[PDB]
């Protein structure tokens, strides 16, 4: 019962699967795709003190994983290393197939202690955690992720405009924090510039400010003292310096996507795994900014789809799901030509000559 969308001349409409429309021309399995749009483009606050409030701890629910193919560039990503007060771990170790999220601008690395009243860390809002083409419902220890949603979609087959061409490397900086009482309402954060020098962290501080507050302190912050660790407090009198319709507070008109390279695109003698690019050289970047009505249509559709996807994941017993699109292709083909479809009848929309 997962909704899917159909693009018609750069106009998106949720597929009328109930109305059972056959205007959509599906020819091959290359025309089905899934996209991992992230929550940051919806206008949510992304700073560490407010982003942590959306994740909670629960025991008694197994985790699930979903495959997604294409994605979007993330401005801010997170990396947790939370530990129990007595030295026990809180976050599970990442399985073998899990890898960090590609194309992160800033990586907010958080370390410290806090009570852990559950086995796994879930999202309170119901969204996903994305780890390099593998969306998951829980947080793994030490792996970079970005919170977002996934949408299923049917493309045109004209020229592979989407996720194969540009309608028209990268640097990631790590920011290190120290947290105490993680997971509760009494949590406290400190921004770390070195061992024995921290700055008390507020909500209004943007990553550009933190990197500047870094640079000023190294310049004349008297780090070359043996007194011990000190806490810097910023002065409090200075500022920090069916056709779907969108209902989000803000939608980002542009889309900066990455995707796995086309099989036929590569021609050089790099197909050999020995003489091949590493795990970070696979991806292909692009930029789809020609239209904004379609892009904000995508963001709303993925905002709706997660309602049905979470219920489908709960029923199944498979650890990792890769067969959602194949089931749709089989289901679509069993409904149209399933049996005894009349020539004149509109259900089996064939034409006489």
């Amino acid at each position: 019962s997962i909704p899917l969308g159909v693009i018609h001349n750069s106009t998106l409409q949720v597929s009328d699967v109930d109305k059972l429309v056959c205007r959509d021309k599906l020819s091959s399995t290359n025309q089905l795709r899934s996209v991992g749009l992230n929550l940051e483009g919806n206008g949510v606050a992304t700073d560490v003190p407010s982003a942590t409030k959306r994740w909670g701890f629960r025991s008694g629910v197994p985790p699930k994983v979903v495959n997604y193919e294409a994605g979007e560039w993330a401005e801010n990503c997170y990396n947790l290393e939370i530990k129990k007060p007595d030295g026990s771990e809180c976050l599970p170790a990442a399985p073998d197939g899990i890898r960090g999220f590609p194309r992160c601008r800033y990586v907010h690395k958080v370390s410290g202690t806090g009570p852990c009243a559950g086995d796994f860390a879930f999202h309170k809002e119901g969204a996903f955690f994305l780890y390099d083409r593998l969306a998951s419902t829980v947080i793994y220890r030490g792996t970079t992720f970005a919170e977002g949603v996934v949408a299923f979609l049917i493309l045109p087959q004209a020229k592979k405009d989407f996720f194969s061409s540009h309608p028209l490397g990268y640097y990631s900086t790590t920011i290190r924090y120290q947290a105490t009482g993680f997971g509760t309402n009494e949590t406290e954060y400190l921004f770390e510039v070195d061992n024995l020098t921290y700055v008390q962290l507020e909500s209004r501080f943007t990553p550009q400010f933190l990197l500047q507050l870094n640079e000023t302190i190294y310049t004349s912050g008297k780090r070359s003292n043996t007194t011990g660790k000190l806490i810097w407090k910023v002065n409090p009198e200075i500022d920090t310096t069916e056709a779907i319709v969108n209902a989000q507070p803000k939608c980002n008109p542009n889309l900066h996507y990455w995707t796995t390279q086309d099989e036929g695109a590569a021609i050089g003698l790099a197909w050999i795994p020995y003489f091949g690019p590493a795990a970070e050289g696979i991806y292909i970047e692009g930029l789809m900014h020609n239209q904004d009505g379609l892009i904000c249509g995508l963001r709303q559709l993925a905002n709706e789809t997660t309602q049905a996807l979470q219920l489908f994941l709960r029923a199944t017993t498979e650890l990792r799901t890769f067969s959602i699109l194949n089931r749709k292709a089989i289901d679509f083909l069993l409904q149209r030509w399933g049996g005894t479809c009349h020539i004149l009848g509109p259900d089996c929309c064939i034409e006489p000559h």
Epitope: V199, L213, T216, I217, T219, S220, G221, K222, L230, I231, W232, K233, V234, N235, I238
Partner: nanobody, 122 residues
């Protein structure tokens, strides 16, 4: 840390020009707005001039707009008030503050020099 020091004041005739200087060493990175305040005997302290560290914006009082200029050299850790067209009402002690942003665990903020007397003779 941002130990301030005023200089350049003294006795001077009305209608002339004078340059006041305020210097600082120690940190001088953390400073955010060097300024200029004045106190006549028996009077409260009132604003004269203000400049941001990045020369982002300059602000002057209405009684002093058009006659005073505030500038800085950046790579001297110094700040100047070059002024013109004195009047006897400016006879007072001139101070420079160095209100910074971060400050260590003493958390003092709003550093303040000892001040220098400017006397206008007419």
């Amino acid at each position: 840390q941002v130990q301030l020091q005023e200089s350049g004041g003294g006795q001077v005739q009305a209608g002339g020009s004078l340059r006041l200087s305020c210097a600082a060493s120690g940190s001088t990175s953390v400073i955010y707005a060097m300024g200029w305040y004045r106190q006549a005997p028996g009077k409260q302290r009132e604003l004269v001039a203000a400049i941001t560290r990045g020369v982002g914006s300059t602000n002057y009082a209405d009684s002093v707009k058009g006659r005073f200029t505030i500038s800085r050299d950046n790579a001297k850790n110094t700040m100047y008030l070059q002024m013109n067209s004195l009047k006897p009402e400016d006879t007072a002690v001139y101070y420079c503050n160095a209100r910074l942003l971060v400050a260590p665990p003493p958390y003092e903020y709003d550093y303040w020099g000892q001040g220098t007397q400017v006397t206008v003779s007419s």
